[PDB]
Assembly symmetry: C5
């Protein structure tokens, strides 16, 4: 079966729609998500036209094999989608209404700069390659674009699922390709990071600062080095979940900066001891008293500066 012939030299418009049924497994590190949706397609094939008076029927149902169907593929998929044709309906004028249900592992990158206080635009790109007889162009039927109310992406809030209605038409290997951009706008549920990582991480840092109210070098060394190790554990846990980005992230900046605070606290603890040994405890006392204010103040300003740069 060949494609529908043109009345004049007009391209064949394949009207499309994606209706999300299930949306799951957003793997931040892999920059992939899994989708289970309806894909609706509609085009006119005048060869399939019939008089509803003579045929009696208002619609005709065909099996995929029986008629010409455009080869629509997804651009940003890992492997070709698992699809199962739900229905093919032909109206008297030869307007075909195709509907399939698919599942695919979509590969769409994320911007980790503001994580875990980030929003993302996930993309699903539909594409059609033109044939030798006819040039095929994609369209968005907005009435057939949507999502189920139940659609739950774990740890994310779904804001919108819309399509950029004008296709990106371009030549590829001396044939026209018509690409459509479906955008799933989501935003991260940052809540759990506050009691699980952020607050634990701050408590261990504040525990290191108790060394500014201690003259015991042996105890201070323990306080600052032990807490530094706990910070390393959190840094490792975090980087095992976040992918390695060519750009600096907000979480990255904060986690790194905190190392400097541990490093400088070790210097303070060392300086204080050296002076106490050198029989200069008055000077050590001045440095320790300053540190008590300096450390939280510099920490607060540094965070204000970082938050400002990133948001």
């Amino acid at each position: 079966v060949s494609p529908p012939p043109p009345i004049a030299d007009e391209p064949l418009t394949v009207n499309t729609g994606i209706y999300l049924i299930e949306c799951y497994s957003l793997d931040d590190k892999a920059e992939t998500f899994k989708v289970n949706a309806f894909l609706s397609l509609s085009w006119k094939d005048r060869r399939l036209a019939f008089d509803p008076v003579r045929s009696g029927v208002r619609v005709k149902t065909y099996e995929p094999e029986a008629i010409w169907i455009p080869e629509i593929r997804f651009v940003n998929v890992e492997n070709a989608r698992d699809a199962d044709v739900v229905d093919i309906s032909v109206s008297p004028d030869g307007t075909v209404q195709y509907l399939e249900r698919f599942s695919a592992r979509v590969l769409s990158p994320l911007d980790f700069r503001r994580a875990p206080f980030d929003s993302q635009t996930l993309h699903i790109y539909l594409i059609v390659r033109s044939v030798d007889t006819r040039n095929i162009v994609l369209a968005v039927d907005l009435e057939k674009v949507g999502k189920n109310d139940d659609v739950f992406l774990t740890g994310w809030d779904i804001e919108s699922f819309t399509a950029v209605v004008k296709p990106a038409n371009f030549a590829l290997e001396d044939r026209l390709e018509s690409k459509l951009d479906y955008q799933l706008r989501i935003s991260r549920q940052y809540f759990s990071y506050i009691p699980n990582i952020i607050l634990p991480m701050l408590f261990i840092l504040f525990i290191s600062w108790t060394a500014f109210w201690s003259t015991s070098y042996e105890a201070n060394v323990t306080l600052v080095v032990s807490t530094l190790i706990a910070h390393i554990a959190f840094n490792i846990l975090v980087e095992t979940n976040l992918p390695k980005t060519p750009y600096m992230t907000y979480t990255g900046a904060i986690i790194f900066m905190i190392y400097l605070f541990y490093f400088v606290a070790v210097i303070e603890v060392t300086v204080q001891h050296y002076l106490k040994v050198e029989s200069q405890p008055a000077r050590a006392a001045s440095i320790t008293r300053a540190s008590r204010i300096a450390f939280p103040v510099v920490f607060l300003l540094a965070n204000i500066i970082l938050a400002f740069l990133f948001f």
Copy 2:
């Protein structure tokens, strides 16, 4: 093959049943479970009717291809179910009895608020899309809904497997859809968490409180910081298994609260030392004596308050 024609304008009732054979792999983090069950379907197709006297046979067996079979799908599946037709039987009146055995990875969310002392309702949603000629409606044949006594979900107790008999009929992409809710009510076997996480986690906390019967700052620092680190390890272990929830959980509340106890114990240990150094050990002694009672009392009340709020 087209759907059965109506005797008036009645919808086609497809009677359904799910009989669980195997029920496994409840992945709390993924909010998925795997099921292996029988799916039974029954509808009347008058075109298949026969006189048992003339045909001799009381029943006729057909191959799926030979007759019209309704396209029943599962809503909340990752990928389309692996199904293998067991039997298709037609009675003289044209009543079809279909039976298949399937396996599917069902995606049903969990409420982690009371974990690990939680119960869940897992769902399996059956659905059928209406055709242009006939509107298809699902029904529950209660005699064909059940589970094997052997059905064992590891780390969970199966309470019930029932169906909400009235289908949810609604329009989707300008066609009627008939949805049925099958509910598997389960409850967590919390036992192992008591000797594995809960009691170990309490023992390390109580070990930190031995610092209230010690004047050795260096030893106290070791006690409180070491145990804090062991608590961090347990917190990490727990959050690697529990998914990140937009809501506060009972396990989350407790784990977080305990950090405050470690933080305040470090403050106490610091204050006690500072005073001992400042040649004020009487005041330090009063604070230490109070802490001995205050810490367990506040811990017990805080837990009473939390348990109350959550249960």
Copy 3:
């Protein structure tokens, strides 16, 4: 093709056999194992009978499609077995001899009570559903039940592979089902746990008891808390491999009990210090001297009691 017709009203006996070729991937946590075996089936179909004198041939080979074959399924499988038909042979009386080679992920639970000194009975349940015309019953042909000498389950010793010859015949959804129990009796190779977990775990415990020959509180705190942390690491390692059981296990009991020994050692260390500070070292000395004997004695008796209760 319909099932073979009965001479009188007798059920159709399908003689079965399973011959293990490969037996691998026993995942204790998942309570699954993978099997690769021969499945042999044999039944009489009088319609296939021939005179070996007239036909010349002593046997006839058929393709699965050519004849009626009973639908045999496995009960406790995750997904339906990957099977590839090896041979179908018909004798002059119409006795069919079917042989296929399959692979399946069998789901059979384990009793972790005595782990790692435990034995298990793995099961493979064969089943057949009766048809409308004839009732099908399973049988065990013992000459066709066995295992390859090479069959190696890693970390386990294969004791036996036998079948419970009497099938479990029962009604399920108003049809007879005939179930056969194939049992693979195995026993754990516990050896490696002795040098890898058991002895390391005891050495760290005995290191904590060296605090009973020390008056240095600071050193004792370090000994007992450090070793407690190493025990937590081993506890975590162990529970990451063992599934969460609703019952107490031998490994669970021991690992838990050891926490009590660490907890009580911390109390001893605390009491000894308090008394030494209170200028009562004679009393502290008596308590420390007792602990030296009490701790190993109570440890040995507690283990004797536990081993007795579990074995």
Copy 4:
């Protein structure tokens, strides 16, 4: 269907092209990458030639089954590629233009010597085995070799995707094989390793060197041993991601060398204490003062030497 016959004695030239659509999952440890691309093939089959007047069509579309297609395989794949034929077009002279879209897990090794400041050449080898009637030879159609501008390999920069135009023609099992080398030149985005591993790892090392400004053996032992343990954690994290190479890597050399610095710091700390105890603090003081300069200087030179050897 047999291969096209030769006019003369010429081999059959199959012109090839690979156009990368998606390029993902570079697993350094596994030395594999996943690709999703177009594979274009073109050859002349004079048997397929036609008159466009008689057939009406100027080009003919065939299903793969309908005609002879060369069996092109990938050499360095794990499993045979998932391919889905996009189009097969025959021109009146019998010139066939085949296009499929595939996904494959390509197995191409990496040189970890300069990691994470390394570049790689990934390979995709196309191959065709000659038949008994005709010898088949591969060619590169450069106009059909390329990549999408969007093609993003996470944590890597794509430099080029080119083909070595001359095939490697050789005998294999008494038949000619024609192999083509497609090369994807990439280079690692090393950035994230600086704040995540490199700088944390240096800070802990520099913290160990604060023991050269301390006379407290107990504190020094803590500083050097604690930081040594944090270095072990980083070493483990790194080797869990990098494969085990038979050659020394730059990351390997650095990580190993740092152990020597920790080992020697422990010796210094031990020597300093021994002398202080032996009532020789003047000698200990000289050794400690030297260490303050020696340790960073030797560290800097050692790194200069290593960087020089590796780059």
Copy 5:
């Protein structure tokens, strides 16, 4: 299609060959490897014979369906191999030459006794079951056994790929089975274990021995216990990669033995302190001086003895 008939009562010889293209994913813990190779088969079918003068053709190419092909399976595979037929060629005498390209996950056990200084013999067992009409026997065509020079098993050196030319013929379920043993002899690239595990593990042990040049109990306790914990980390890392063997391994013996050295060092440190407290430092001094020589000497001899027993 039936098998070739015998001239006289002779078995049918199927000549075989395996030519490795790709050899990857040796999973020591799983005792599996993945292979991608050519499988060549050749037998005489006199029914396929032709006169090359009358037929014109020197060879005939058949589709698998067209002729009788022996059912060859692999014994030690997880699941049946993914195979794709490359060619089937018949010579005038009826000599068939079959060639397919396959991929399979082969399950062949390893002897971990000498790891990581171990060599292995991996096996690929080819098998054929005799049919009722003819008995089938396997043979090795040595000209068709080989490997690509590029064949690279990561972290292993490929020494040889040969076949044991005489098959293992045996009866299985009253039919002859002919088994061929293909052996891939490999040897581990132990290099990386020296800088990654072996040398780090020795450095931490030697750091524990610095306690023999210290009178500070508190510091010694820290040295020996901290390093013991780092040894536990390495032991865990190692056993997460090595499978649990019913026999003692070289790596196992060494790792275990080292615990005894840590245990005894703790005893020495304890004895030294007890004596120092008991105002007997002269005796403690003698014990400490002995330990300085005893510990390395006993370590070196113990290793000599172990290496001797294992190699």
